[PDB]
Amino acid sequence: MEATIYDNTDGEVDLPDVFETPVRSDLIGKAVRAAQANRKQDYGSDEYAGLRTPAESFGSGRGQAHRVPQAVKGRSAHPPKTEKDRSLDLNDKERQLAVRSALAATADVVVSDDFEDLVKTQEVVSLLEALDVHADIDRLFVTSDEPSTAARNLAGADVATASEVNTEDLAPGRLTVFTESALAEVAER
Amino acid sequence: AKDGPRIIVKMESSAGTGFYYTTTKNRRNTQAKLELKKYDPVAKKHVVFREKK
């Protein structure tokens, strides 16, 4: 239904069954996770400092008790194993499904192709005057085969493309504008 | 089993060659060479079985 075509006064297009549907949160979140998940990095506590030196665990009989664990500045105990497989690879079908129902959630705004031409960030200022809002504040930049140039850098920069943009991209609580071949992304969908 | 050169020696028989055989334990005890009884090789059925081995 209400798939509003930019260039305001200008026409209307239709919301497809795909986005239409009803929504899958557990999954959405899943998507998210998938995201930061494979992105993070990793950490560690010196193998050397931790099991390096020569420890003389003072025999016995003498009034004491024993390079090992539990005295100080060393040992670690079960540290930021630089040795810990950080990845998290969700799963293709899972994921894309995600970008999917999520985007549905987004439908809850229609970049009229012509726009792939506008050549100036002040021009942005312009389309902006055209439809500003807090949702606007959300603001996500989407072109459809190779970016809407200038559009790409402003108090909200970013520019995904008709192929290669995803929940990571914006399912994240935001609001936006994808260019029609971006609806080609639709195709992907 | 427990190879005993005692009056207890293992032995088996044949079906005229009904082919193979079947399981028996025996005693020099009485009757030496002696050893005849009948059976059923996979060969047909029955047959003369001599037991010596």
Binding site: - | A1, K2, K25
Partner: protein, 63 residues
């Protein structure tokens, strides 16, 4: 990674999807037993319960 006392996997040891397993009768024979005939009538398959668990398990993966 992983494995099976590939051994018991091989001598005795196989699973029917039921998630159960069998091995050979094994009650005597194949060593001593001047013993008998009808007893020989004793070597088709044996199905040990519960324990067919360390069993199954340790084999897990292939068989």
């Amino acid at each position: 990674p992983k494995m099976k006392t590939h051994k018991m996997a091989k001598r005795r040891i196989k699973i029917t999807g039921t998630g159960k397993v069998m091995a050979f009768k094994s009650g005597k024979r194949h060593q001593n037993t001047g013993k008998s005939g009808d007893e020989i009538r004793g070597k088709g398959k044996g199905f040990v319960l519960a324990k067919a668990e360390w069993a199954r398990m340790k084999l897990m993966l292939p068989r």
